Each structure stands twice: as structure tokens, then as C-alpha cells.
Amino acid sequence: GAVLHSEPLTVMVLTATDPFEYESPEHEVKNMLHATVATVSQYFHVKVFNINLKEKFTKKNFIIISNYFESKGILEINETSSVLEAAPDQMIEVPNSIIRNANASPKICDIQKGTSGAVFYGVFTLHKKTVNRKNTIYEIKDGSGSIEVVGSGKWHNINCKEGDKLHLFCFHLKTIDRQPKLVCGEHSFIKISKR
Structure with a gap:
């Protein structure tokens, strides 16, 4: 039972895997990647199911996510979600402590x-x-x-x-x-x- 986050959230991308194959809940093999992102207060693990977003999920990029899902504290982005590039005046200041926590x-x-x-x-x-x-x-x-x-x-x-x-x-x-x-x-x- 995932929950839906409708509102824009600006995050900084910390890490991302290459795409890899997995099986979807409709029993089809597709590609996904794992990423980690941060707000000014917290980091999150993210499962990215729309592989067309792979360039946006590049380390140190700022992106704005909306209509994404959350299950067991992990964020999930699928085709129905929106992931926009943040404008320069939309960047956020992520403390290095959050980045250290994310890598631990x-x-x-x-x-x-x-x-x-x-x-x-x-x-x-x-x-x-x-x-x-x-x-x-x-x-x-x-x-x-x-x-x-x-x-x-x-x-x-x-x-x-x-x-x-x-x-x-x-x-x-x-x-x-x-x-x-x-x-x-x-x-x-x-x-x-x-x-």
C-alpha cells in the first residue's frame, strides 16, 4: 500500500545506478535504476521506473519531483510521475551531513x-x-x-x-x-x- 505525493519537491541527486532489468507487477521485464536524493533536511532512496529519466538522475543535479509514490519510506517514480529540471533559482542548500548519512x-x-x-x-x-x-x-x-x-x-x-x-x-x-x-x-x- 503505497501513498501518493502530489506536491512538487525539490531534491538534489546524490547517486544513481546504471539501468538494470527487473520484472514489473504486470509480469513484464523492464528497466529501472536505484537513486538517492536529498532535501535540505533528509535523504531518500528512490526507485526510478521510467528509464527515460536517467539523465536527470545524475549526481549533483537538482530536480523537482511530483506525483511520486512512497512505500516503506522509499520513493518511487513511474511514468505517471513528473520530474522537472530545477531552474537555477530553484536550487537548495543540502548540508554535507545529510550526504554523509546517505552514504553510510x-x-x-x-x-x-x-x-x-x-x-x-x-x-x-x-x-x-x-x-x-x-x-x-x-x-x-x-x-x-x-x-x-x-x-x-x-x-x-x-x-x-x-x-x-x-x-x-x-x-x-x-x-x-x-x-x-x-x-x-x-x-x-x-x-x-x-x-
Whole structure:
């Protein structure tokens, strides 16, 4: 159950992925990208479903979004949304603290406290990989704990080795055998950093 934001909101683009394939709710494969943006008070993760907007979602661009959606605190832009270039006199002053917050990853111990279905993003070191038959277990670890990431579909058996860093986008928390795990969903994405 998403909510609709009708009013213009000026944001500064912080980061954006390249386009990648995903399956839509109508069971069609299309392209999307993940982005992060900031107002003067807060940063947001954004799912961008209209790939024609990829040039507007460039780092340090100022854009004005309207008729966009929000689910679980994540903003969603689809074809029906409006994304305009901000005029020079429409720029906003984003404190560097917000940008630092946006780039910070959550600690695994805090992911482990999440409610079922909570959504997380971050960059984590791969500690152990178990390639099963229908899915792959990527055990990630930081100084606060360890958690299993369950990858299937596009994220089954990806080309990585223990020690690499995995940048996880839009994974969600699920209890599996009395244990919190991160699992992929419709809009999940992984980026590998070799080490």
C-alpha cells in the first residue's frame, strides 16, 4: 500500500545506478535504476521506473519531483510521475551531513533488529558463500555481527568470492529458521566490488 505525493519537491541527486532489468507487477521485464536524493533536511532512496529519466538522475543535479509514490519510506517514480529540471533559482542548500548519512551503511546488528519486511541498503564484506540449487547464501559480516543474504533469480550464483564487497540495494528482512535474514525482492540489485 503505497501513498501518493502530489506536491512538487525539490531534491538534489546524490547517486544513481546504471539501468538494470527487473520484472514489473504486470509480469513484464523492464528497466529501472536505484537513486538517492536529498532535501535540505533528509535523504531518500528512490526507485526510478521510467528509464527515460536517467539523465536527470545524475549526481549533483537538482530536480523537482511530483506525483511520486512512497512505500516503506522509499520513493518511487513511474511514468505517471513528473520530474522537472530545477531552474537555477530553484536550487537548495543540502548540508554535507545529510550526504554523509546517505552514504553510510547500517550495522548488521541493527538490520537484525528490523521488523519483517523492513528494507535495507548498504555495502558489506562477503564472509562465506554457499551456492545451493535454487538460491545462494551470501553470509556478510561487519564488526557488529553476521547475517545471511539469500539471493535467487538474477542474484543466484553471481560472480563473487569471499572477501569481495557486495553493495545491496532494496533487500528485505525475513525470519527464516528463527534467524533474521536479508532476502531479495522485486527491485533488489547487487553490485560487486572485487577485493
